[PDB]
Design a protein around this ligand. Structure first.
Ligand SMILES: NC[C@H]1O[B@@-]2(O[C@@H]3[C@H](O2)[C@@H](COP(=O)(O)O)O[C@H]3n2cnc3c(N)ncnc32)c2c(OCCCO)cccc21
Length: 188
């Protein structure tokens, strides 16, 4: 079933996410917090990082500016995917890779922890946001074509280290076991 997963981020402690597909953790290429999530102000960087995409900034000169205008954007005129980058990168808890942290109103503050891991290869909501904003799309479930659409079907784990070859249900169990031993999550 589901899991609580911890993504460490510099200066912000852990960002906890709820996922029903922990098996897809090696395909989590970014993270999304609800715009009013309390850690966002802590996460905002002082300077857009080098590899910030201009589509990520709301056209603003700094992370805090983009965040403020995006929040303001949610009040005015309060569909398509919108959001901004915070400047922050969290540590993926199974691969160690950097995952950029966004805010976007498709993530509800009041559901779960108010934060998700985003797996565009296998969640069409995340696929849509990644295709609008230009985020990497990683296949970890064999069976479709993640360059055309999220693959939500059954298949075997790939590009996922000790999960490779596992069926999805077995992969959920194994990744959760590893998260528990590593202090990085639990079943929920
Ligand atoms: N996103 C990557 C991975 O994780 B998913 O997305 C999170 C989390 O799992 C899921 C939790 O929904 P349920 O409690 O009903 O089970 O919704 C999403 N979610 C959790 N909290 C959220 C929030 N606050 N706001 C918006 N979405 C949220 C997920 C999928 O969800 C399919 C089920 C959607 O109803 C399918 C494939 C891959 C995944």
């Amino acid at each position: 079933q589901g899991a609580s997963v911890l993504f460490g981020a510099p200066g912000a402690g852990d960002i906890e996410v709820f996922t029903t597909r922990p098996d897809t953790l090696f395909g989590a290429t970014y993270m999304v917090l609800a715009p009013e999530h309390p850690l966002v102000d802590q996460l905002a960087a002082d300077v857009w990082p080098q590899d910030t995409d201009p589509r990520w900034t709301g056209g603003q000169d700094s992370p805090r500016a983009a965040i403020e205008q995006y929040r303001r954007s949610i009040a005015a005129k309060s569909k398509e995917k919108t959001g901004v980058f915070t400047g922050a990168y969290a540590t993926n808890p199974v691969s160690g890779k950097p995952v950029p942290v966004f805010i976007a109103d498709y993530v509800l503050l009041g559901y779960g922890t108010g934060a998700i891991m985003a797996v565009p290869g296998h969640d069409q909501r995340d696929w849509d946001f990644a295709n609008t904003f230009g985020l990497p799309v990683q296949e970890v479930i064999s069976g479709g074509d993640v360059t055309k659409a999220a693959y939500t079907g059954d298949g075997v784990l790939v590009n996922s280290d000790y999960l490779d070859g596992l069926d999805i249900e077995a992969a959920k169990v194994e990744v959760t076991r590893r998260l528990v031993k590593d202090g990085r999550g639990e079943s929920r």
